[PDB]
Amino acid sequence: AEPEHDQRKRMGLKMLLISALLTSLLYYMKRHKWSVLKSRKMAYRPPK
């Protein structure tokens, strides 16, 4: 009924592994860049 079966699960594994790695590696690069805005601090200094 589904001869691929085997190669299908084999890939699945591979997918889960890249997908784990790559998703994490990007969680970094998303934060890294965003940090600038998250750490940011502002103040309202009217005139005298």
Ligand X SMILES: CCCCCCCCO[C@@H]1O[C@H](CO)[C@@H](O)[C@H](O)[C@H]1O
Q: What are the residues binding ligand X (CB under 6 A)?
A: 3, 5-7, 10
- CB count in 10 Å sphere of residue 31: 10
Give the nearer residue to ligand X in terms of CB position, either 4 or 38.
4
* Distance of closest approach, residue 5 Cβ to ligand X, in angstroms: 5
**Closest residue to ligand X, based on beta-carbon distance:** 6
C-beta of 1 vs 25, nearer to ligand X: 1
Helices (H) then strands (E): counts for the chain: 1, 0
Rg (CA), the chain: 23
